[PDB]
C-alpha cells in the first residue's frame, strides 16, 4: 500500500492537514484507532482564532462555519463582585474570535474528506512506525485481524497526547517540560440558551467557573473541581447549584438551567516536547504539546502546527525545497511557548490553588485588578486571546 | 514637651513628612534612635519616581537634585545574550525617572530641617507610644539617661521595618502578608564611571546582576547571592569577577572596576500590613510595607504615603476636616498592592530560584521574551517602572 504523507490520527489536526494537502495534490492516508462515532462524541473546544477560521476557508471547509459560527468581540472576567469586559476588537486592533464547537469542525472535515474520496482507515489497530531516519519510512497496522504495510515518504503524528508517535521517538533525543495542575474542569453541555452573548470567565472563593456557548440554543459550562472527583458524584442539579454559587448574582438569576447532554471531567496540564520531530516523523497538535483549557489555545496551536507542516511539505513537493523541513520545530516552538505562557497565566490568575498563603491570594487579586484596569494590561490579554500572528516561513 | 505631629524616625519618610508639614505651619518633632552619621551611612536607593521629584520640589528641597540628579529615559534588560532597551519616555507617555542616591536626599532634608529650625532629637533611646485611641496621645523616651514625655495630637510612625510603632499596635487588629525570598543582593559602591548611561538589569544562569549609578563618576552594582552568604567572603576582586561573568561580554569588557567604598548584603522581602493605622497612629514607608529592591519602589512608596498623610493632616488642621484621616489606609493600599505586584513580577522574572523545574525556567524565559517583544508588554513594564499615578484625595 503506498502514499505520499501518512497521517496518524483523524482528530482535527490530522483531518485538517489531510484536507489542505489533498487540495494541493499531495496524496495522503489517515489512520485512526477508533470509529467515526467515537471521534465525533468528544466535545472539547469552543473558541476559534481568526487564524484557524482562515485555514478552514483555505481548506474549502467553511460553509457551515460562516453560517452557524458566532463571531465574538469581547469576553468578560469576573472577580470580587466586579465584571470587567475586555473589548478584543478595540484592544487587538480589530482581530476577533469565532465560537464554533470542535465536534462541528471535525464533522465538516470528515464530510469534506469523504466527498473528495481521500483515504481514511478507521479501526486501524496497533499502529507501529518503522525506519524513521530512512528515505522510505513505513507504517504497519491491523485491520480486522490482518497486518498490512503502508509505505510513505513522510509521517505526521496527529494522534493526541496518548498517541503512538511521540512514543516512537528514542526518548534520549527528547526534552519534556510538564506541569500538572492540582485540579480539573467539570464541563456540562445543555440544550439551553446561554446566559450571555459573550463568555464570562470567573474567579470565585469556591473556585473557578466558565460560561460558554455552542450556538443561540446550546450552552457549555465549567466549574473547577479537585482531582479526587468522580463525574457520577455530580448530578445535574448539584452542578447547577454550584455554578450559580460561583457567579455574580445578576448573572446566576437569569441562567436557564436544564439536563445535560454531556458531562465529563478534564484534568489540567501543561506539556511541551522539544524537538517536535525525528527523521521523517513530524508531530502536530496534542501529539507534541498540551495547554490547560483556560486560554482556549490547544486546537488553535494544532492549526498553526498544521499550517506550518503544510506550507513546508508544499515547498518540499512543488518546489523541491526539501531541506526547509528541518525548520518545522524552530518555527512551531516560538508560537507554542508564548501560548503556553498565556495559558499558564490565565490558569494561575483565575483558579483557586491549595495552600496558598495570604500573600499569593492578594497578588492574584492584584494581577486581576492591574491587567483589567490598565489600557496596556488589557491589550496584553487581548492580543494573546485573539492569537498572536503566524510566523512567515522562509 | 508638646507638639502637633510627633514623627518617629529621621530616615527619608520622617524627614520629608516633617518638612512638608513645617512649611504648611503644622508643628512637628522628629525622634531618632541613632546619630545623624549612622543615618547618612546607609546607601540604599538610587532610582526616583517623577512623583517623588515633585514632592521634594513641593518641600523646597530640590536645589542639588535638579543640579546633580540624572534624568533617565530608558533601562535595559538582558537575558539569553540579548539586550533589550525599554524606552520609558516613549512607552509611558513622557514620564521619566531620576537617579539621585538616598544618602543625598536624606542629607538635603537634614540640612533643610536644620536651617528652618525645626525640632529633631537624635539618640532618643527606648521610644514608647501611649494612649493611641485617646484625644491626647503621648510619646515617652530617654535622652542621655532621663525619661521625657512629648505630648501630641497625632503620631506618624516613620521608623522602618524594625521600628517600634508597628509593634505598638494590638496584633489582633493587623493582618500581615509576607513572602521571604531565598536570596539576597550583594551590593558594591565604587568611585568608578558607570558601564552605561542607563541601568542594565540582567538575568543570567549564575543568577542576577544589576548595573546602576550615583553620578558620572560613582557606581552601584549588585549581584544575587544565596542567604548563606557572608559579606567578608566577598573580596572586591571576587565580586568584580562574578559581576563580569553575569553580564554580556561587550558590557563586561568596558567595565571600569575599582575598590569599594561600601559593600553589604541586603535580604529580599515582600511585606504588607493592613490596616496602616490605629487610633491616632499612622504608619508610613517601611514601617508599614517592604518591597524587594528589583522594582525600585520602596522609597517611592514612602513618598506617596507621606504625600497622602500630609494632604490629609492639612485638611485636618487648615480645614477642620479631621474625619478624612480614616481614609489614609484605603488610599495608600491601592497604590501599595499594585507596586507590590510589579516588584514581585520583576523579582520572579530576573532572578534564579532553587529547584526550579525545566518548565518554570522555560516560562521565565518566555515571560521575558513576551513582555520585551510586544508594544503592549513593553508598556506595562514601563508605566509601572516610572510609577503609576497618585490618587486624588477627597
Ligand atoms: C475541556 C477541554 C476544553 C478545551 N477547550 C478548548 C478551546 O475552546 N479551544 C482550544 O483551542 N482548545 C481547547 N481544547 C483542546 C483541544 O480539544 C485539543 O488541543 C485538540 O483536540 C487537538 O486535536 P488533535 O487532532 O491534535 O488531537 P485529538 O483531538 O486528540 O485527535 C487525535 C486522534 O488520534 C487518535 N489516536 C491516538 N492514538 C492513536 C493511535 N495509536 N493510532 C491511531 N490513532 C490514534 C485518537 O483516537 C484521536 O482520534 C480543549 C480540550 C479540553 C479537553
Ligand atoms: C539594597 C536596597 C536597595 C534599594 N533600592 C531602592 C531603589 O532604588 N528605589 C527605591 O524606591 N527603594 C529602594 N530601596 C528601599 C528604600 O531604601 C526604603 O524603602 C527607604 O529607606 C524607606 O525609608 P523610611 O524612612 O521609611 O525608612 P528607613 O529608611 O528605614 O528610616 C527609618 C529610621 O527610623 C529609625 N528607627 C527605627 N526604630 C526606631 C525607634 N524605635 N525609635 C526611633 N527611630 C527608630 C531608624 O534608625 C531609621 O533612621 C532599597 C533598599 C535596599 C536595602
Which residues, listed in sequence order, are joined to residue A271 by a DSSP beta bridge?
A178, A290
Instruction: Give the span between the Cα atoms of B47 and B69, in whole angstroms.
Output: 10
Residue-level length of chain A:
394
As a dihedral over the C-alpha atoms of residue A99, residue A103, residue A108, residue A114, rounded to 10 degrees, the angle is 170
**Within 13 A of B334's CA, how many CA atoms are on the CB side?**
12
Alpha carbons B286 and B157: distance in angstroms, whole number:
9
Tell me how crowded residue A354 is: count the other CB atoms within 10 A of its CB. Answer: 7
| Cα–Cα distance for residue pair A206/B231, rounded to 1 Å | 47
Distance B160 CA to ligand 2 centre (A): 5
Answer whether A137's CB lies under 8 Å from A280's CB. Answer: yes
* Cell output for B107: 542629607
Would you give the distance in Å from CA A48 to the centre of its chain? 9
Q: What is the distance in angstroms between the CA of the first residue and the CA of the last residue of chain A?
A: 34
* Gap from CA of A298 to ligand 1 centroid (Å): 8
- The label of the residue with cell 504497519 reads A140
- DSSP class per residue in B226-259: ETT--GGG--HHHHHHHHHHHS-HHHHTT-----
For ligand 2, mutation pick of B293, B300, B342 (most atoms within 8 Å of CB): B293
For chain A, domains (ranges, CATH) are 1-72+96-180+269-351 (3.50.50.60), 73-95+181-268+352-388 (3.30.9.10)
**B282 bridge partner residues:** B156, B277
Would you tell me how many other CB atoms lie within 10 Å of the CB of residue A368? 20
Print burial letters for B108-142: b (CB count within 10 Å at least 16), e (below 16): bbbebbeeeebbbbbebeebebeebeeeebbbebe
Angle, CA A269 vertex, CA A268 and CA A274 arms, to 5°:
165
Does A357 contact B179 at a Cβ distance shorter than 8 Å?
yes
Q: What is the DSSP string of A285-319?
A: GGGTEE--GGG--HHHHHHHHHHHHHHHHHHHHHS
Nearest listed ligand to the Cα of residue B33: 2
Hey, are the CB atoms on A362 and B337 less than 8 Å from each other? yes
| Residues in CB range of A57: below 8 A, 6 or more apart | none
CA–CA dist A319, A1 (Å, integer): 26
Q: Cis before residue B275, ω within 30 degrees of 0?
A: yes
Bridging pattern class, strands A218-226 and A260-274:
unpaired
Q: What is the resolution in angstroms?
A: 2.3
Among B262, B237, B240, smallest CA distance to B252 is for: B240
- CB within 8 Å of A232: residues ≥ 6 apart: none
Who among A178, A338, A370 is closest to B341 (CB)?
A370
Q: Are the C-beta atoms of B138 and B130 separated by less than 8 Å?
A: yes
Residues 6+ away with beta carbon under 8 Å from B373: B84
Q: Name chain B contacts of A268, Cβ cutoff 8 Å.
A: none
Structure solved via: X-ray
- Please give the sequence-ordered ranges of beta strands (E in DSSP) within B57-145, or none if there are none: 70-72, 74-79, 82-87, 97-99, 119-121, 125-130, 138-143
Question: Which is nearest to A390 in space by CA: A318, A323, A332, A328?
Answer: A332
CA A215, CA A218: separation in Å to the nearest integer? 5
Select from A268, A293, A223, A305 the least CA-distant residue to A47: A293
How close is the Cα of A160 to the center of ligand 1, in Å?
5
d(CA A271, CA A301): 13
Q: How many CB atoms lie within 10 A of CB A227?
A: 12
How far is residue A394 CA from its own chain's centroid?
26
Instruction: Name the β-bridge partners of B125.
Output: B142
Residue entry with cell 490605629: B278
CB A197 within 8 A of CB A71: no
Reduced to 3 DSSP states, what percent helix, strand and coil does chain A have, rounded to the nearest 5? 40, 30, 30
Please, are residues A173 and A277 in contact by the beta-carbon 8 Å criterion? Answer: no
CB atoms within 10 A of CB A138: 18
Among B134, B137, B133, residue whose Cα is nearest residue B154: B137
Do B285 and B196 form a contact (C-beta atoms < 8 A)? no
**Which member of B179, B370, B380 has the closest CB to residue A359?**
B179
CA dist B284 and B286 (Å) reads 6
Interface contacts A/B by beta carbons within 8 Å: 67
CB-CB neighbors (< 8 A) of A357 in chain B: 179
For a ligand 2 pocket test, name from B14, B33, B36 the mutation site with the most ligand atoms within 8 angstroms of its C-beta. B33
Q: Whose CA is closest to A224, among A210, A234, A241, A238?
A: A210
Instruction: Tell me the helices (H) and strands (E) count for chain A, helix number first.
Output: 13, 20
Please identify which residue in the block is written with the cell numbers 481614609: B327
Q: Find, among B148, B342, B305, B280, the residue nearest to A367 by Cα.
A: B342
As given in the structure block, the three cell numbers for residue A47 are: 473558541
From A191's Cα to the closest Cα of chain B, the distance in A is 39
- Set of chain A residues whose Cβ sits within 8 Å of the Cβ of B177: 358-359, 362
CB B231 within 8 A of CB B264: yes
Nearest to B337 by CA among A58, A177, A361: A361
User: Does A291 sit behind a cis peptide bond, omega within 30 degrees of 0 on the bond before it?
Assistant: no
Q: What is the CA radius of gyration of chain B?
A: 21
Distances (CA, A) of B281 to A70, A265, B309, B347: 57, 53, 11, 32
Q: Would you call B270 and A359 a contact, using CB atoms and an 8 Å cutoff?
A: yes
* Cα-to-centroid distance, A286 and ligand 1 (Å): 6
Query: Is the alpha carbon torsion for A49, A54, A55, A60 positive or negative?
Result: positive
DSSP codes of every residue in B145-181: TEEEEEE-SEEEE---TT-HHHHTS-GGG-EEEEEEE
Q: How many CB atoms lie within 10 A of CB A391?
A: 14
Measured between alpha carbons, how far is A65 from A59 in angstroms, rounded to an integer?
Answer: 12
Ligand 1 first shell, C-beta below 6 A: A 8-14, 31-34, 39, 44-47, 102, 124, 127, 158-160, 162-164, 185, 187, 266, 285-286, 293, 296-300, 302
First to last CA, chain B: 34
Amino acid at each position: 500500500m503506498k502514499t505520499q504523507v501518512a497521517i496518524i490520527g483523524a482528530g482535527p489536526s490530522g483531518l485538517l492537514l489531510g484536507q489542505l494537502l489533498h487540495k494541493a495534490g499531495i496524496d495522503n492516508v489517515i489512520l485512526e484507532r477508533q470509529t467515526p462515532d467515537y471521534v465525533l462524541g468528544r466535545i472539547r473546544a469552543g473558541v476559534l482564532e481568526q487564524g484557524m477560521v482562515d485555514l478552514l476557508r483555505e481548506a474549502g471547509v467553511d460553509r457551515r462555519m460562516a453560517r452557524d459560527g458566532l463571531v465574538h468581540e469581547g469576553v468578560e472576567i469576573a472577580f470580587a463582585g466586579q465584571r470587567r469586559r475586555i473589548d478584543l476588537k478595540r484592544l487587538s486592533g480589530g482581530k476577533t474570535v469565532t465560537v464554533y464547537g470542535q465536534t462541528e469542525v471535525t464533522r465538516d472535515l470528515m464530510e469534506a474528506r469523504e466527498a473528495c474520496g481521500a483515504t481514511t482507515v478507521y479501526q486501524a489497530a496497533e499502529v507501529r512506525l518503522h525506519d524513521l531516519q530512512g528515505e522510505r519510512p513505513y507504517v504497519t497496522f491491523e485491520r480486522d485481524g490482518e497486518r498490512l504495510r503502508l509505505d510513505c515518504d513522510y509521517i505526521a503524528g496527529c494522534d493526541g497526547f496518548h498517541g503512538i508517535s511521540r512514543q516512537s521517538i528514542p526518548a534520549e533525543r527528547l526534552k519534556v517540560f510538564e506541569r500538572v495542575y492540582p485540579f480539573g474542569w467539570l464541563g456540562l453541555l445543555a440544550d439551553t440558551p446561554p446566559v450571555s452573548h459573550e463568555l464570562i470567565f470567573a474567579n470565585h472563593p469556591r473556585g473557578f467557573a466558565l460560561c460558554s456557548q455552542r450556538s443561540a440554543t446550546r450552552s457549555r459550562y465549567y466549574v473547577q473541581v479537585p482531582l479526587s472527583e468522580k463525574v457520577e458524584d455530580w448530578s445535574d442539579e448539584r452542578f447547577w447549584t454550584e455554578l450559580k454559587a460561583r457567579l455574580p448574582s445578576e448573572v446566576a438569576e437569569k441562567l436557564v438551567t436544564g439536563p445535560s447532554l454531556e458531562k465529563s471531567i478534564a484534568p489540567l496540564r501543561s506539556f511541551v516536547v522539544e524537538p517536535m520531530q525525528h527523521g521523517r516523523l513530524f508531530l502536530a497538535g496534542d501529539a507534541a504539546h498540551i495547554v490547560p483549557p483556560t486560554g482556549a489555545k490547544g486546537l488553535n496551536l494544532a492549526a498553526s502546527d498544521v499550517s506550518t507542516l503544510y506550507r513546508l511539505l508544499l515547498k518540499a513537493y512543488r518546489e523541491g525545497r526539501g531541506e526547509l523541513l528541518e525548520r518545522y520545530s524552530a518555527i512551531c516552538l516560538r508560537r507554542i511557548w508564548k501560548a503556553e505562557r498565556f495559558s499558564w497565566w490565565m490558569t494561575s490568575v483565575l483558579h483557586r490553588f491549595p495552600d496558598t498563603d495570604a500573600f499569593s491570594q492578594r497578588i492574584q487579586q492584584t494581577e486581576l485588578e492591574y491587567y483589567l484596569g490598565s489600557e496596556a494590561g488589557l491589550a496584553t490579554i487581548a492580543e494573546n486571546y485573539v492569537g498572536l500572528p503566524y510566523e512567515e516561513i522562509e
